[PDB]
Amino acid sequence: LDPGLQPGQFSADEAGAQLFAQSYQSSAEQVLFQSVAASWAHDTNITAENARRQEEAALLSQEFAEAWGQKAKELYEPIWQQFTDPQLRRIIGAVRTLGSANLPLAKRQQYNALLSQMSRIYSTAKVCLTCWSLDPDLTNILASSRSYAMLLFAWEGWHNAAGIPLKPLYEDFTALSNEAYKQDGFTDTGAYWRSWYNSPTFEDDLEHLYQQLEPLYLNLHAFVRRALHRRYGDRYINLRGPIPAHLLGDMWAQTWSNIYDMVVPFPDKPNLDVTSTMLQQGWQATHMFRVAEEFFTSLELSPMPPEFWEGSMLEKPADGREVVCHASAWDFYNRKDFRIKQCTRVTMEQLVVVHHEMGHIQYFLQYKDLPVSLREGANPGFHEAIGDVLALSVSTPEHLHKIGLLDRVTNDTESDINYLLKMALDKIAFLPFGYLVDQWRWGVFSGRTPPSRYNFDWWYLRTKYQGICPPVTRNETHFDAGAKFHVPNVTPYIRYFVSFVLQFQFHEALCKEAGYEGPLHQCDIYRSTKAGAKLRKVLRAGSSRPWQEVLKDMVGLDALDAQPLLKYFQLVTQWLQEQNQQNGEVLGWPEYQWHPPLPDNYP
Ligand SMILES: *[C@@H]1O[C@H](CO[C@@H]2O[C@@H](C)[C@@H](O)[C@@H](O)[C@@H]2O)[C@@H](O[C@@H]2O[C@H](CO)[C@@H](O[C@@H]3O[C@H](CO)[C@@H](O)[C@H](O)[C@@H]3O)[C@H](O)[C@H]2NC(C)=O)[C@H](O)[C@H]1NC(C)=O
Ligand SMILES: C[C@H](N[C@H](C(=O)O)[C@@H]1CCCN1C(=O)[C@@H](N)CC(=O)O)C(=O)N1CCC[C@H]1C(=O)O
Ligand SMILES: *[C@@H]1O[C@H](CO)[C@@H](O[C@@H]2O[C@H](CO)[C@@H](O)[C@H](O)[C@H]2NC(C)=O)[C@H](O)[C@H]1NC(C)=O
Ligand SMILES: *[C@@H]1O[C@H](CO[C@@H]2O[C@@H](C)[C@@H](O)[C@@H](O)[C@@H]2O)[C@@H](O)[C@H](O)[C@H]1NC(C)=O
Ligand SMILES: [Ca+2]
Ligand SMILES: [Cl-]
Ligand SMILES: [Zn+2]
């Protein structure tokens, strides 16, 4: 560790810890910057040399974290929890958590190499017939093909190509991760991840939320299943069994927006799939990012800085480079460099992803002057919700008309049902998937799910919650959890379930602050500077205060609550129940063992 980056001495009291935290701040920004920069160089240019450089940067980060972590415990272990300054407690509490820096050198190097190899495997996997990549080739197949056989080839090809080689690395990663966090006092890595929410009843509270939401999903599922049956027939769709996992428009069946044309109940109302109009009008990636920015500035939030426009990667490179295409937002921890890396495609769903990522950037901009340990969301679900809340306003038929994507305007019951059904295909279909991913991972970290049951327990949960089945037989050579980005890239997932509930609480509060008095699902907070100011107070807080209190200041309640989501969807919830009843549907999938047959002469 360079001399300028090492911790000195400080007195063993609160006045000293304050000076300790200020000296830490200075050197942490340098160490974090070099680590984020090396990660950027690799993720926009996957090469063996760039991976080597990223591993060396990660090792330096661990050396820094150990030195300052050990100094914090040396001086403050018996007194930090009684400090008067609540922000200083949170800073010291974070610095004394070493994570992977608890491992000995040889195991640190093994850990860093596993992260690098798992990332490379996921983002360079191909399906060959001449080879298709996930983004854009396989993505476009899953969204627009209606050939059962072509969808099956793409789904099976991707899951085999990405998942099978990841499994031995993921086993080794799990054991090293658990060994590291056991030294911080956690029973396993999952217990450390859940601790970020500072709620002793976290798992029960989530289960109670899902009980309120499940009927809405069961009814959307049965309605969509019926539509698929009319197109694919009784051989490939069982009206009392799970839906084949490759027929819902998306590689993970996690958002169903791309099958809207098969389910839309009132098709002579205005056409809400505005992707065609974006194409017809010549929208490109940079248009999409500028339109998102202007929503933020309409609220008197910050524009994107020059450093963002000069540094970001907003299209997939055409120069034969391998990149990580999965969209992401970047804080370089120097209060100046902020970027997005996205292989942007011209579609309405991608316009929503652009808003999602710009919400992350806006948080970074607003909390950049806090101490580095407090530059995070009040909890991770807050960070995930910011951009989605603004996109709820952008998606409204009224707002799409204002930006030239919907010429005709209607305000009637049929048009509302169309809109709420389209929104449900995104927000309601996702809920079981958002909930189940970390149930799977918590069981792997705790040891309830050993390697011998990775795929058995994954498909148990996929069927239990989403009501889908794999369209070809799977066994424990397959590792289908690994074919989802966040698993090999070690990103937690329960934050997205939390976000999809929270964003409707945020929306209701901002709409009220803006003075809006119509139906919640027709609110558009565009140009509301009062709503902007309420949101800004959240963003500028970072993690300096307990999330329960920040939430109470914003929405008037100190807990997650499903009521605003239920209020938003109420009209289509009622309508779908009526339709399924009149159609005589069975809600659920009691033929839980059913799988579809293979196509004749496949492949
Ligand atoms: C689409 O249309 C709805 C429904 O409008 C209502 O029903 C129609 C059949 C007509 O009879 C309309 O004249 C009638 O308003 C609109 O929702 C309605 O918005 C108005 C405000 O613009 C609401 O009135 C307010 O209600 C609050 C109390 O909640 C009072 O304090 C206010 O003084 C004011 O009276 C009305 O409650 C609301 N109705 C419903 C069912 O939500 C909606 O605004 C419109 N959408 C667009 C984009 O124009
Ligand atoms: C498209 C989105 N990409 C993630 C996100 O933006 O959350 C990326 C990859 C993992 C983290 N991440 C970041 O950008 C972080 N750096 C943010 C931060 O540091 O706070 C994604 O995975 N989403 C969108 C909703 C559903 C879910 C999905 O598509 O499965
Ligand atoms: C992708 O990364 C490679 C390194 O892995 C870069 O290659 C270097 O390019 C510079 C150009 O100024 C040369 O001076 C180095 O000798 C190259 N290194 C190696 C190992 O070949 C490459 O430039 C990067 N590509 C892009 C587009 O950034
Ligand atoms: C696991 O599955 C592997 C490949 O899938 C199999 O081959 C296709 C063509 C179908 O027969 C499908 O039903 C099978 O699952 C096999 O290579 C492998 O031997 C299977 N078993 C084990 C223990 O790996
Ligand atoms: Ca981050
Ligand atoms: Cl999380
Ligand atoms: Zn996000």
> If phi over 0 gives left and psi between -120 and 50 gives alpha, with beta otherwise, what is residue 198?
left
- List of residues 6+ apart from 140 with CB closer than 8 A: 345
Distance CA 552, CA 533 (A): 16
Closest listed residue to residue 346, CA positions, set 402, 399, 275: 275
Contacts of 75-82 with CB under 8 Å at 24 or more apart are: 75/10, 75/11, 75/12, 75/16, 75/17, 75/20, 76/12, 76/17, 76/20, 79/12, 79/13, 79/14, 80/17
SS3 144: helix
Task: Report yes or no on 590 lying in a domain.
Answer: no
Is the CB–ligand 1 distance for residue 522 below 6 Å? Answer: yes
> In which residue are the tokens 């793409």 written?
154
For ligand 4, atom 22: residue with the closest CA: 477
Distance CA 539, CA 369 (A): 12
- List of residues 6+ apart from 185 with CB closer than 8 A: none
Task: Report yes or no on 594 lying in a domain.
Answer: no
Residues whose Cβ atom is located within 5 A of ion ligand 7: 384
Q: Give the ligand whose atoms come closest to the C-alpha of residue 416.
A: 1
Task: Report yes or no on 591 lying in a domain.
Answer: no
Task: Report yes or no on 13 lying in a domain.
Answer: yes
Q: Is 360 one of the annotated binding-site residues? A: yes
> In which residue are the tokens 């299943």 written?
225
Single-letter amino acid code for the residue at 368: K
The residue annotated as part of the active site, out of 398, 486, 513, 595, is: 486
Distance CA 152, CA 601 (A): 13
Helix H or strand E segment including 297: helix 285-298
SS3 584: coil
SS3 272: coil
Closest listed residue to residue 499, CA positions, set 357, 382, 331, 363: 382
Tell me which DSSP letter residue 197 carries: T
Is the CB–ligand 4 distance for residue 475 below 6 Å? Answer: yes
In sequence order, the β-bridge partners of residue 39 are none
Write phi, then psi, for 556 (nearest 5 degrees): 85, 15
Distance CA 480, CA 207 (A): 24
- Evaluate whether 421 touches 521 at the Cβ level (below 8 Å): no
The verdict on whether 349 is a catalytic residue reads no
Nearest-5° Cα angle at 328, 325 to 330: 130
Q: Is 170 one of the annotated binding-site residues? A: no
Distance of CA 130 to the CA centre of its chain: 31
- List of residues 6+ apart from 220 with CB closer than 8 A: 424, 425, 428, 429, 576
Contacts of 535-539 with CB under 8 Å at 24 or more apart are: 535/299, 535/301, 535/386, 535/389, 535/506, 535/510, 536/301, 536/366, 538/378, 538/382, 539/362, 539/363, 539/366, 539/367, 539/386
The alpha carbon dihedral of 97, 368, 291, 325 has a sign of negative
SS3 87: helix
Distance of CA 251 to the CA centre of its chain: 15
Task: Report yes or no on 595 lying in a domain.
Answer: no
Distance of CA 518 to the CA centre of its chain: 30
How many Cα neighbours within 13 Å face the side chain of 457?
17
For ligand 1, atom 1: residue with the closest CA: 411
- List of residues 6+ apart from 375 with CB closer than 8 A: 331, 333, 364, 367, 368, 542, 543
CA of residue 30 to ligand 4 center, whole Å: 50
- List of residues 6+ apart from 214 with CB closer than 8 A: none
Is the CB–ligand 4 distance for residue 477 below 6 Å? Answer: yes
Distance CA 170, CA 115 (A): 9
The residue annotated as part of the active site, out of 156, 293, 357, 585, is: 357
Q: How many structural domains comprise the chain?
A: 1
Is the CB–ligand 1 distance for residue 546 below 6 Å? Answer: no
Distance of CA 229 to the CA centre of its chain: 31
Distance CA 434, CA 254 (A): 8
- Evaluate whether 126 touches 161 at the Cβ level (below 8 Å): yes
Q: Give the ligand whose atoms come closest to the C-alpha of residue 156.
A: 4
CA of residue 518 to ligand 1 center, whole Å: 5
Closest listed residue to residue 420, CA positions, set 598, 259, 272: 272
Distance of CA 370 to the CA centre of its chain: 24
Closest listed residue to residue 298, CA positions, set 539, 531, 535, 528: 528
Tell me which DSSP letter residue 412 carries: S
In this structure, the strands spanning 468-469 and 243-244 are parallel
The residue whose CB lies within 8 Å of the most ligand 2 atoms, and thus the one to mutate among 338, 356, 366, is 356
The verdict on whether 357 is a catalytic residue reads yes
Is the CB–ligand 4 distance for residue 84 below 6 Å? Answer: no
Distance CA 218, CA 465 (A): 10
CA of residue 357 to ligand 7 center, whole Å: 6
Q: What is the span of the domain harbouring residue 179?
A: 1-584
Task: Report yes or no on 600 lying in a domain.
Answer: no
Q: Is 231 one of the annotated binding-site residues? A: no
Is the CB–ligand 4 distance for residue 582 below 6 Å? Answer: no
Q: Give the ligand whose atoms come closest to the C-alpha of residue 41.
A: 3
Distance CA 516, CA 138 (A): 42
How many Cα neighbours within 13 Å face the side chain of 322?
15
Helix H or strand E segment including 329: strand 328-331
CA of residue 381 to ligand 6 center, whole Å: 7
For ligand 2, atom 16: residue with the closest CA: 329
3-state secondary structure 344-385: CCCCHHHHHHHHHHHHHHHHHHHCCCCCHHHCCCCCHHHHHH
3-state secondary structure 464-512: HHHCEECCCCCCCCCCHHHHCCCCCCCCCCHHHHHHHHHHHHHHHHHHH
Technique of determination:
X-ray
Residue 474 alpha carbon, nearest atom of ligand 4: 15
Distance CA 405, CA 455 (A): 43
The residue whose CB lies within 8 Å of the most ligand 2 atoms, and thus the one to mutate among 43, 255, 313, 328, is 328
Distance CA 23, CA 369 (A): 15
CA of residue 328 to ligand 2 center, whole Å: 6
Helix H or strand E segment including 328: strand 328-331
Single-letter amino acid code for the residue at 221: H
Q: Ligand 3: residues within 6 Å at CB?
A: 45, 47, 49-50
Distance CA 389, CA 507 (A): 6
Distance CA 275, CA 280 (A): 9
Peptide bond into 397 cis (omega under 30): no
Distance of CA 384 to the CA centre of its chain: 7
CA of residue 112 to ligand 3 center, whole Å: 22
Distance of CA 84 to the CA centre of its chain: 36
Q: Which two tokens stand for residue 427?
A: 């927000």
Task: Report yes or no on 424 lying in a domain.
Answer: yes
Q: Give the ligand whose atoms come closest to the C-alpha of residue 48.
A: 3
CA of residue 531 to ligand 1 center, whole Å: 21
Residue 331 alpha carbon, nearest atom of ligand 2: 19
